[PDB]
Write a protein that binds this ligand. Structure first.
Ligand code: TTP
Ligand code: MG
Length: 641
DNA sequence: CGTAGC
DNA sequence: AGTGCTACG
């Protein structure tokens, strides 16, 4: 059955285990965590969860043999210092040591190994959860129990009476079930190693291991570095914005109260509907629940009466002040090592299109520069609150219409290629065509609306929805759709070809080989069929974009790893020259990367990005990247030197 | 389900 | 329930 080897029990056993580990090229280390049971005696305390303490590691390189490694203060001959030195020695790559480390929940394992244990891995990684995601990107988040059931049933009974295996975290990370940390870590390590062998066989069968080891797992490593770094958050430039928007809120409240003649609650939709549609006789739309008070109907009614405009403005600003201001202010970590407050989001890569999202909180869902003025515009935005460390500047690198360039690549539209190769800025052109104005006369919000429209036709938009958004009639929207389709016939050819491919093969192929499965295209419902077709088109295009940005991330990390021989990330800095210097990667926005570059390497690192993002993949269309730098994310300015 | 980003 | 990836409330 289960065979746990207590390595730290005998000196000879420890030495032969170390020799075998050094002679091994594929291991499955893991972590063990227990309760305090009341620091520096049970193990290294885990950052964040002060009630949890690390205990041991579990390494399994085949079969059911789990070699448990103890970092406890207790074999008295083997002290903690030389044991730590040995563990660091066998967990580092050197002299072409092509070792693969299989860790479940690699980001969290890397973080705990760095901050508390003080050791950072440098070998190839083979996270089994990532491979399970690669198999079925649209599937639910893979817990240990799910991957064990779906990829290792014979050894599945090893989890009998183990309710902790169903949690999101690894078996050896949770502070739950009564099982000891050592045994839990050992059984989890055996299970993940065997399941990862099965997953590697499956990926080799599917021809997906290259995209799993060359870009995907290095992208997980980059995301671990991003989680270690965090985003520099300053409350000096956030509290002021919060107070300004609260002042605007109360001003709008008083104005609406004096206009309507009475005080009413804005949050309640029924009261707003009664006040606006009934009392003020505003024209109701076709479609409790007496009237609909959605954003689009309020926007349509903005011109007719001033009050709906104030209501809509109050709703946004309160959405900014509750869904954004509160999550950011609630979780900010003040660390003296960087000398300023930061925020550490949790990077989730299990999205259905290969995109990278952030949970607790969602940083990318921060309101942009929207200007509102009260008794000229203030340009209120919380993006300015993301001030980097002192002596450093945020260096974003926005892809210049990556989605359109990629679509032109797999569509081979001569007109699209020739309009993207130049600095035409097709979004400005379509905005100028729509508004019958000069391209330079367009604004930021107008250009954003134009780009939303253009991507709407690009991914497939109904005539009615395009009419409601564009403010034009349904027939005019249909004629606009037809003109857009006829102008770019290659886009239609690519869309039809990829829809046919999704219907035939049952899935779609990203340009780096990753696949997403859409059974819904075979659904008899016309809604489901059309939704799955548009889902397939956007899935291939957006997965290509996300894989391009992930290749850019891993290439930039490699380039600033070879250069700038300093501490790799703030997590490595706190794992324990003095000046902060590096190209730390702090945020991804689904099309761009934020780098908290130091004030001395602003230009050179930027150039590196402008290389690696440009030559990430040799496409049919040159991938323009605008590198912007600034003292904050809010007011970053373009840099073309 | 409505709304914010991409 | 007819632009899609999300995340939060
Ligand atoms: C606004 C918008 C973006 N997107 C997607 C398309 C791409 O995946 C991504 C674009 O990210 P942006 O970085 O927002 O778009 P861009 O690269 O096209 O251009 P700009 O330099 O003007 O900022 O977001 C939509 O699908 N629909 C929309 O309405
Ligand atoms: Mg962008």
């Amino acid at each position: 059955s289960l065979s746990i080897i207590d390595v730290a029990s005998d000196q000879n056993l420890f030495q032969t285990f170390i020799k075998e580990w050094r002679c091994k090229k594929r291991f499955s280390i893991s972590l063990a965590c227990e309760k305090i049971r009341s620091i520096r005696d049970d193990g290294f305390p885990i950052k964040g969860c002060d009630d949890t303490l690390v205990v041991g590691l579990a390494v399994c390189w085949g079969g059911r043999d789990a070699y448990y490694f103890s970092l406890q203060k207790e074999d008295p001959s083997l002290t903690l210092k030389d044991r730590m030195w040995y563990l660091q020695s066998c967990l580092r790559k050197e002299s072409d040591k092509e070792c693969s480390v299989v860790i479940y929940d690699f980001i969290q394992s890397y973080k705990i190994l760095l901050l508390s244990c003080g050791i950072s891995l440098e070998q190839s990684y083979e996270d089994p959860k990532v491979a399970c995601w690669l198999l079925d990107p649209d599937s639910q988040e893979p817990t240990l129990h799910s991957i064990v059931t779906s990829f290792l049933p014979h050894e599945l009974p090893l989890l009998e009476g183990m309710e902790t295996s169903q949690g999101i975290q690894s078996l050896g990370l949770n502070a739950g079930s009564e099982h000891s940390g050592r045994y839990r870590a050992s059984v989890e390590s055996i299970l993940i190693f065997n399941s990862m062998n099965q997953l590697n066989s499956l990926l080799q069968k599917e021809n997906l291991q290259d995209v799993f080891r060359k870009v995907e797992m290095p992208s997980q490593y980059c995301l671990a570095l991003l989680e270690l770094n965090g985003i520099g958050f300053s409350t000096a430039e956030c509290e002021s914005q919060k107070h300004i928007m609260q002042a605007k809120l109360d001003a709008i409240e008083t104005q609406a109260y004096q206009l309507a003649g009475h005080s009413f609650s804005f949050t309640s939709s029924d009261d707003i509907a009664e006040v606006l549609f009934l009392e003020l006789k505003l024209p109701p739309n076709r479609e409790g629940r007496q009237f609909s008070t959605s954003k689009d109907v309020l926007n349509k009614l903005k011109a007719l009466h001033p009050l709906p405009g104030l209501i809509l403005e109050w709703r946004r600003i309160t959405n900014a002040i509750t869904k954004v201001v509160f999550p950011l202010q609630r979780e900010k970590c003040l660390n003296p090592f960087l000398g300023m407050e930061r925020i550490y989001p949790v990077s989730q890569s299990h999205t259905a299109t290969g995109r990278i999202t952030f949970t607790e909180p969602n940083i990318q869902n921060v309101p942009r520069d929207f200007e509102i003025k009260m008794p000229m515009p203030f340009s209120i935005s919380m993006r300015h609150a993301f001030v980097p460390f002192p002596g450093g500047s945020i260096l974003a690198a926005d892809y210049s219409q990556l989605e359109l360039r990629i679509l032109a690549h797999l569509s081979h539209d001569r007109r699209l290629i020739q309009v993207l190769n130049t600095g035409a800025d097709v979004f400005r052109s379509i905005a100028a065509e729509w508004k019958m104005i000069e391209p330079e006369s367009v604004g930021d919000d107008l250009r954003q609306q134009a780009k939303q429209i253009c991507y709407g036709i690009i991914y497939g938009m109904g005539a009615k929805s395009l009419g409601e958004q564009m403010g034009i009639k349904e027939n005019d929207a249909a004629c606009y759709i037809d003109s857009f389709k006829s102008r770019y016939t290659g886009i239609n050819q690519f869309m039809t070809e990829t829809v046919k491919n999704c219907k035939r093969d049952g899935f779609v192929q990203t340009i780096l080989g990753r696949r997403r499965y859409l059974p819904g295209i075979k659904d008899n419902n016309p809604y489901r069929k059309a939704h799955a077709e548009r889902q397939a088109i956007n899935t291939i295009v957006q997965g290509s974009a996300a894989d391009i940005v992930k290749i850019a991330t891993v290439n930039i990390q490699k380039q600033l790893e070879t250069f700038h021989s300093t501490f790799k990330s703030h997590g490595h800095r706190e794992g324990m020259f003095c000046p902060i210097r590096g190209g730390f990667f702090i945020l991804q926005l689904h099309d761009e990367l934020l780098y908290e570059v130091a004030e001395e390497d602003v230009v050179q690192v930027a150039q590196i990005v402008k290389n690696e993002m440009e030559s990430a993949v040799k496409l049919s269309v040159k991938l323009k990247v605008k590198v912007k730098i600034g003292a904050s994310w809010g007011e970053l300015k373009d840099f073309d030197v």
